[PDB]
Each structure stands twice: as structure tokens, then as C-alpha cells.
């Protein structure tokens, strides 16, 4: 139907540049202003600027003056946002959005592109067990899990028993540690009886580092 | 120029009427739009030009206002409405209002996990406290080592409100070096929550 299609996630050092693309599909690309709006994790939306794909004219929030360049290729109906001299605090999901009318009603949105900016370098996580024991059992329920630690950048995926186990699974949002490395926990609650009869294994996948780890989680002895 | 939204967050029950207010610091326009952003998703246009319902959006959503004072209403809150809502006037975007579903108070189940031998051998110890399936979101986790309150030492993370049972879960990690870890004996996390009569302490003795 009618769509905005954005390029994939980016990972950048400070001082690098990033160029994010936004392809318009199903409507006249030159007929509408395209805007860029960004969102830092856990924060609100921040408008960056617009481009007129017909004329090439651009207008930027003052904050990004000198660092942002918006461009278009009418031949492939694609808008681009390039942000240079990147700062760690440019870490955000970057959305393109279509201005439907002079209301600036943004009716059509791209799915967003994550841009991570850090002095950190790519690193696979260390996966440690969160062993079930008497201190993680009550009322016939046992909790267990995996600690996925010191990885960069986002994201990682975690499954349990190759995806056979889905109920009671909580995979928490990662935290950015004081090291600039991410750490997250994935836990599952199970009938405590099954600790004696079932093997539990977390399957951790960190594609940016091509790391795949399976960790058996044994009850503490 | 600043856009203000009130309240910053709210809880309401299914079937409740929810009203969110947006105020411009100074006059901008009568043109104001409202967006809904669900966790993990792009913002979605719900109301345009103050009061017009976007085509295909359920009729329980509405908006009103002019000048500098605007409101957004969900007539009858539904489970699928959990999201953050934003007002906007041109370049100016409000800080957002998070809406979650109000349910019966649920006390968390509190669990604690010692560091693994694998991690210790690598020189670090992480102790994890898990609070499971609680409501409301507000909760307090503080770590005690030999009964000394910790600070600058831990981070926590909270899930999105669960779709089937409307609860939250919270994971907190205390981290320190193995050398530091082995200095002390008792590791405890002390949990405070509306559903708990008094704080709950979950703890273990190293070795």
C-alpha cells in the first residue's frame, strides 16, 4: 500500500557520520514534505527538520544546524538524513515522517532506524546463569534466568529451550552500564517441581558480534 | 517555546474516561495533532487539527481545544490503548503522557540470585534481585551488604506492562569486583511496594 521504508540500524563512533534513508512507496514523493523526528531511548520525540523533495529546500532545528544534511533522490523516491560529527547523545531511533498537509499532521511514519553512537567497540556478551534455588522459589513457583552482560551494541535476542518455552518468560530492557556496555537479564518462572525434571537453557544471540551462546541453567547445589 | 502535557503519566481502568491536556507556553496555532506510540512501535496519528479523528482510528478517541489549551480524550479505555501519547504543533512536541491499565494491587514475588562461578572466575560479581508480576509500577529496591546501604552500585530495568495480566516485573543488578565481593558476608535486597505490608528482604550469606 503506502509506506515509508527506512535503512537498517547503524553503530557509530563519535565524530563519524551516519546517513539514514527513507524510501517513499505508493504516493507521489515530490508532493509532500518529508520530516525527520528522533527519539533517544526512554525519551520523547524531537523534531529535526524537513526537506521539500520537489525543490530540495530544507529547514533544520537550530540544534542540528551545521551537523545535519537532508537530501533526496527523486529518481528512486528516497529521502536521506545525514548527521555528522556524531555525539554519543545522538544515540536515538531516527524516524522519517510524511507531512500530509499544512497542519504538519504526520500521517505516515517509517518504522525507525536505531543509530547507536559510542566510543565503545563491538563486543559479544558473556552469558552467566541465574541459578534457581530456595531463594528464587516460593508458592510452588521457581524463577531462573540468564545474565547477558557487557555487550555492545544493541540488540540481543534471548530464547528459552530453543523457543519451546515461552510462558513466564521476561526478557528485560538492557541497561547501559557505566562501562558504556549493555547488560540485560532474561528470566523465566516455572513450576518449581520442573527444576528436578527439566533442563533449562537460554539461547543468546548477538548478531552485531556474530555471537551465539547457549547456557544451561542448573539449580544451585 | 515549551509544550506542557498533564499529567506525565496516568493509570486508569478499562472503561474509564481518560483526558490528557496539552498547553503551549505561548500562542502557536489552532493546528495541533495527537499521536499514540505503543512500545517498540512508530508514533501513529490519531487526531489532526485539534479535533479531527484520523480515518480508521476508533471513535472512542477525540480531541478539543484552541489557542494554547488542548485536550485529548479516550472515552472508554481499552487494553490496547496502553501507550505514550504526544501533542504537537509544528516543530514543538510535548514530553508525552504514559498511560497504563489500572488493576488490583499485586505484590511482587521477590527472588535473589548469587553470582555464578563462571562470572567470579572472570573477576566480577553480579547479584540479581527479581521482582515479579506486580502492580502498580512504583517499587523501591535497595541493596544492603552487611547491612550497609549501597549506592552508585546497581542498575534496574522494568518490563512493559504485560498484555495478559497487566503486571510489571523488575530486575535489579548489583555489581562489584570479586575482590570487593569477598570482603563482605551478607547480600540483601530490600523491596518496598504498595502490595507489601512491610518491606521484604531477600538475602543470602556468601558461601
Residue numbers in the entry:
A (entry chain H): 1 to 52, 52A, 53 to 72, 72A, 72B, 72C, 73 to 100, 100A, ...
B (entry chain L): 2 to 208
What did the published study say regarding this structure?
The HIV-1 envelope (Env) spike, a trimer of gp120-gp41 heterodimers, is the only target of neutralizing antibodies (Abs). As exemplified by VRC01, the first such bNAb to be isolated, VRC01-class bNAbs share a common mode of gp120 binding in which the VH1-2*02-derived variable heavy (VH) domain mimics CD4. Two forms of designed gp120-based immunogens were subsequently engineered to bind and activate germline HC/LC VRC01-class B cell receptors: gp120 outer domain-only constructs (eOD-GT6 and eOD-GT8) (Jardine et al., 2013; 2015) and gp120s modified from the clade C 426c Env (McGuire et al., 2013; 2014; 2016). Here, we present crystal structures of inferred germline VRC01-like Abs alone and complexed with 426c-based gp120 immunogen cores and compare and contrast their gp120 recognition with structures of mature VRC01-class Ab/gp120 complexes.
